[PDB]
Design a protein around this ligand. Structure first.
Ligand SMILES: Nc1nc2c(ncn2[C@@H]2O[C@H](COP(=O)(O)OP(=O)(O)O)[C@@H](O)[C@H]2O)c(=O)[nH]1
Ligand SMILES: Nc1nc2c(ncn2[C@@H]2O[C@H](COP(=O)(O)OP(=O)(O)O)[C@@H](O)[C@H]2O)c(=O)[nH]1
Lengths: 292, 314
């Protein structure tokens, strides 16, 4: 009954009904996880209806944004997000930490990767057409993000394989020259890589330089990915990986709790460590024990 | 099949690698770690056979040492620029000069010691960290140092693979991984950073005094060190040797190792349980249809899992 209201309020566009929905989905308590799953399944059915009633075309554009600390991410999101909402867009910003004036904006929602897909789906369900996933670095959590988005963007300061677009930040005042230099270096680096051709642009949230041109290259990437069929192929691939991880997690809870498996596990771990048994043979044994 | 076995040329290879490891040859240990790190199916089959031979020898070694452990495993972490590299170099020369055979294994999601015949330093590339620790102990190393970077996730996995977790925190707001630290070293306590380091130290001593104790015998210490002046480095090693002694005497080291071993063995078993399951033909068939039903919102992952488990059984 509670799920049905939080569902209705989220799909009607009420910000609080989506802010509580994400908190629910993020919970570790068993009863709260059961409520989150029911809610997510209602959203999944509706999400499928909305795309079918949009002639198979997706309803949002998922953007992954990353860079080092101090790159100018927060300042960029604030400028870029205001530019989006003013043009008619409803924008979500979801930060994922491996470690403003936009918060006052009625058309924007500002909130590891364990529930990120669930949050993306809740936002698309709520009616947002631009989902921005913000992260830090050039490593592990950054790779998980690239696999949850349509387009991956890198913000690199003035003072790369997976990136669809690279933006050289703070290209203002006495940092224009170093920014033009770093840009030249990245354009040079890409020209050597074997594969849309990733672009290197210079921006400034302080001056506004290159921000509109960035959004236009983003819309071009989007257009190409839809026309070529690569966007749906990528989403399909991403969906398979996500669905399988949800199913394998359920396969293992059911398996590790089964009384025969529980009862044999301690003895089996001892045998493996003492070098009396291999993990593969210990696993074969357990699988047979579960079956019989 | 039996299960199948190993080609005689592969069996000669593992035996040569095994003998050169246990005899202490640095290249054989280096090749063995590379072998364990491989993602290719035949290489993983060879790595498992080798690791099983080292597991049996490791047990022989511990029995011929009256059940007492043969290496002290230390975990070292901190932010970039804390002074980890500089510290390892100073501390490693200090230990090897005192008769120890030291391994340094760096692990990353984020020198004069390299010339040392008594040190083994392996570059950055936690899935195989336990296997690498065991290969080093098999090779005869008595001090295993696991270096990581950060105050997060990969740092928590390290704390669960070592006997003692040490944090290197610079003098110039954690809440945090300070909970898992056995010892905290406030680095660069030299020159005009002595005063900030004394202040930062007081803050961490204050923070710990609030946390509930992970041990009945050890109280985490906050010391100030400087690899530049040598300050606190000898005193650090002495508190490390004390932690070790208290942990052995109290039985907490073996309890901790036991707990850690259960987590490791379960992960290995679980991984083989999922390869065997996901490759099962009745399972493989069904997976595509099932993932569609979950995504369309027609089915829950738990119900999809139940239909998959039934399919495997029948
Ligand atoms: N000169 C200049 N500085 C900027 C610009 N954008 C951000 N900064 C500054 O760079 C620093 C980092 O900004 P922030 O957005 O918070 O970086 P973040 O850590 O990546 O989120 C701050 O002191 C900003 O004021 C820019 O376009 N021009
Ligand atoms: N003043 C002072 N500087 C140090 C000390 N140890 C390291 N440094 C400096 O701090 C910086 C970080 O050192 P490094 O060992 O490479 O840090 P890491 O990234 O944690 O491995 C370097 O510029 C070092 O020279 C110290 O004991 N005293």
């Amino acid at each position: 009954r509670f799920v049905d209201k939080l569902y209705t309020g989220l799909i009607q566009g009420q910000r609080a009904c989506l802010a509580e929905a994400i908190t629910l989905v993020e919970s570790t308590h068993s009863r709260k996880k059961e409520l989150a799953q029911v809610l997510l399944q209602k959203v999944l059915l509706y999400h499928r209806e909305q795309e079918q009633s949009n002639k198979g075309k997706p309803l949002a554009f998922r953007v992954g944004l990353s860079g080092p600390p101090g790159a100018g991410k927060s300042t960029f999101i604030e400028y870029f997000g205001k530019m989006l909402t003013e043009r008619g867009h409803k924008l979500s910003v979801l930060a994922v930490d491996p470690s403003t004036e936009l918060s006052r904006d009625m058309n924007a929602y500002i909130r590891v990767t364990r529930t990120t897909n669930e949050a993306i789906l809740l936002c698309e369900g709520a009616g947002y057409d631009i989902i921005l996933i913000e992260t830090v670095g050039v490593g592990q959590s950054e790779f998980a993000v690239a696999d949850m988005v349509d387009m991956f963007v890198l913000l690199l300061p003035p003072a790369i394989e997976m990136a669809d677009l690279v933006a050289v930040t703070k290209s203002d005042g006495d940092l224009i020259v170093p920014a033009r230099r770093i840009q030249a270096e990245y354009v040079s680096a890409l020209k050597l890589l074997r594969k849309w051709k990733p672009k290197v642009i210079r921006i400034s949230a302080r001056s506004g330089e290159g921000i509109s041109e960035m959004w236009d290259k983003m819309k071009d990437f989007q257009d190409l990915m839809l026309a070529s069929g690569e966007l749906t192929a990528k989403r399909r691939k991403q969906q398979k990986v996500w669905m399988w991880n949800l199913i394998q997690e359920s396969v293992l809870e059911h398996f590790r709790t089964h009384p025969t498996v529980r009862e044999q596990i301690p003895l089996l771990e001892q045998k493996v460590l003492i070098g009396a048994l291999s993990p593969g043979l210990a696993a074969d044994f357990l699988l047979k024990a579960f079956k019989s």
